[PDB]
Design a protein around this ligand. Structure first.
Ligand SMILES: [Mn+2]
Ligand SMILES: [Mn+2]
Ligand code: NA
Ligand code: NA
Length: 327
DNA sequence: CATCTG
DNA sequence: CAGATG
């Protein structure tokens, strides 16, 4: 956790680069298990050969760990941190809508900067365009104080459209958190579930309302169950307009809301632990459901949930207020 | 995983 | 349709 940090860190720099610059998914994948194991490792790795001893740890890594222990640096890491190409890709990538794949093409065409991008707005698709337009706003965290206003709106409007809607803002917002990166709204409706054959309007009606009132500003992606957008709290009495925030809205069959809501609420750690305990308790849990575990190996059949309560109960556990869902 | 692009 | 992005 700090005993083999540098090592796990450099490993991660390397791993990342294989994947983002080169295409070395294998190698990439290589540095990854490596850090994963050294990460777990109980002692202070004093040398390569020692590490080597571990699984995932081969000869090349070993080598690298040595140079790093040997000197506060690694040549290769130093070579990569300079190199403009490598840099460009890590940068372009910051634009919403540009993955590495695209980052490569651009750089190879000579687009390496924000300006470059503007000048070639032609080569970008809608998502990317938006991503470019809101570069700054998108990188800005979301203060809970804005979150509440946001949540306040969405909730009111969904209500207007149909009393039967059920929305929840999951994410860290939900677990307390003073600020967040984006807004994640979970949505269901009684009339939408597991077997029920669709109802697209279910998700399209709300989106529309939100745009109606000008909360949602742009569309990144609109499907029948998932919507990726941009929203914004109405700038009061002109002098202070808000940033543009990322927002997502997803439809869920009522017969699996809570599991979803449980799940999205996280933290990752809380999940796992709960996940592991469910397992003990003779159960199964994933994004959408909880199932009684047979003995023959595994086994299914969706246990029926009406709240986050129903879940814990099942696995027989202390109902956890979202705040203390941390780890 | 669901959506988009081409 | 494969392949990209979130
Ligand atoms: Mn989130
Ligand atoms: Mn998001
Ligand atoms: Na990106
Ligand atoms: Na292939």
């Amino acid at each position: 956790e700090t005993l083999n940090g540098g090592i796990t860190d450099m490993l991660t720099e390397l791993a990342n680069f294989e994947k983002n610059v080169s295409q070395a998914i294998h190698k990439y994948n290589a540095y990854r298990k490596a850090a994963s194991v050294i990460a777990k490792y109980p002692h202070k790795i004093k040398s390569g050969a020692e590490a080597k001893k571990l699984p995932g740890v081969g000869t090349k890594i070993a080598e690298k760990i040595d140079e790093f222990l040997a000197t506060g640096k690694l040549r290769k890491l130093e070579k990569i941190r300079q190199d403009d190409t490598s840099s460009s890709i890590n940068f372009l990538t910051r634009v919403s809508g540009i993955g590495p794949s695209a980052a490569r093409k651009f750089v190879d065409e000579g687009i390496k900067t924000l300006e470059d991008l503007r000048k070639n707005e032609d080569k970008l698709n809608h998502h990317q365009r938006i991503g470019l337009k809101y570069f700054g706003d998108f990188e800005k965290r979301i203060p809970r104080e804005e979150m509440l206003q946001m949540q306040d709106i969405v909730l009111n409007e969904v209500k207007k459209v149909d009393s039967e809607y059920i929305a929840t803002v999951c994410g860290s917002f939900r677990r307390g958190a003073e600020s967040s990166g984006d807004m994640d709204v979970l949505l269901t409706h009684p009339s939408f579930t597991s077997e029920s054959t669709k109802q697209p309007k279910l998700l399209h009606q709300v989106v529309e309302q939100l745009q109606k009132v000008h909360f949602i500003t742009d569309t990144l992606s609109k499907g029948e169950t998932k919507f990726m957008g941009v929203c914004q709290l109405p700038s009061k009495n002109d002098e202070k307009e808000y940033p543009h925030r990322r927002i997502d809205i997803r439809l869920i069959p009522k017969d699996q809301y809570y599991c979803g809501v449980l799940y999205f609420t996280g933290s990752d750690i809380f999940n796992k632990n709960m996940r592991a305990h469910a397992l003990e308790k003779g159960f199964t849990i994933n994004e959408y459901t909880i199932r009684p575990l047979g003995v023959t190996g595994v086994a299914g059949e969706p246990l029926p949930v009406d709240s986050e309560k129903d879940i814990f109960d099942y696995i027989q556990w202390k109902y956890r207020e979202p705040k203390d869902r941390s780890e």
